[PDB]
């Protein structure tokens with residue numbers, strides 16, 4: 001690969017720095033490791049790099065495939081787990097034997113089929129089958145909020161307290177929703193009071209962004225001069241800088257590569273906003289209004305004024321609070337003081 005491959009990296013040789021973050025992740029320093037960061041900050045990348053370098057058995061649940069749904073069924077969750085387990089038995093010969101006595105499992109012949117299941121007994125059997133730590137990756141774990149008919153928390157707590165060879169890695173692009181999922185705020189919840197080893201990926205600063213591009217161009221062996229305009233136009237999100245780098249290498253026209261990145265970002269961001277608006281069709285026009293209003297940032301008064309201007313009616317403070325709270329939980333905006341801002345520059349652009 002190369003530094004500007006437009007897919008999550010799986011090798012450190014293709015990945016710019018984040019050395020402290022990868023090393024912390026790899027430390028598996030508590031039974032649960034949280035990987036945080038906005039979309040496109042490299043979370044799936046460091047997880048892949050981390051598990052490749054550790055050379056430990058693992059189950060990888062890519063939950064992004066549920067992002068366009070409002071609900072995940074027990075059946076659809078089990079089919080994903082089933083697929084991963086089948087990869088794991090190939091690495092853990094004695095697992096197929098250890099899964100034989102699980103109530104809802106059927107074996108035929110070097111594979112399993114589920115025919116509810118005890119997630120805690122399942123995890124315990126991975127641990128029985130392995131001399132080494134087994135990593136359970138829940139990539140975009142906050143998606144499990146949508147898995148309404150299953151509560152995995154007691155099983156996660158059981159593992160945390162009792163399964164010493166089970167190490168979870170849970171990532172989330174929507175920080176508040178991830179914490180809400182794990183019920184960190186609820187004293188009676190199974191994971192309350194338990195510490196998570198936490199790694200956060202922030203957007204590149206100006207100097208990091210410039211160094212990232214510099215490194216990828218030096219590696220392609222091509223000249224580049226305009227690093228500052230690229231940062232000014234694209235911003236610090238690694239994923240967008242990566243795409244730009246790829247396009248510029250492919251075409252060598254600065255304005256074309258910037259415009260193509262901007263147009264790709266806008267399309268992707270607005271599709272992701274549609275995922276957000278799924279199940280909120282009642283408040284849909286209002287959310288669009290809020291984001292346009294907050295594009296160049298604004299205060300509560302600006303949000304209120306713009307909503308009431310569009311609809312004519314007075315709008316309560318309860319409704320307003322709920323709309324901004326949802327946007328903040330899902331990482332669309334961030335509140336600085338009395339100022340709410342899109343969480344990165346191209347989200348401003350997308351609603352401009």
Ligand SMILES: Nc1ncnc2c1ncn2[C@@H]1O[C@H](COP(=O)(O)OP(=O)(O)O)[C@@H](O)[C@H]1O
Pocket residue numbers: 003004005006007008009014015016017018037038039040041042043044045046173238239240242
């Ligand atoms: N430090 C980095 N070095 C090289 N590429 C990166 C880096 N950070 C992110 N990327 C690239 O940016 C894109 C988004 O990364 P990804 O791991 O999917 O982010 P997340 O899972 O946080 O949304 C991918 O193309 C990835 O290869």
Ligand SMILES: [Mg+2]
Pocket residue numbers: 043044045139
């Ligand atoms: Mg990801």
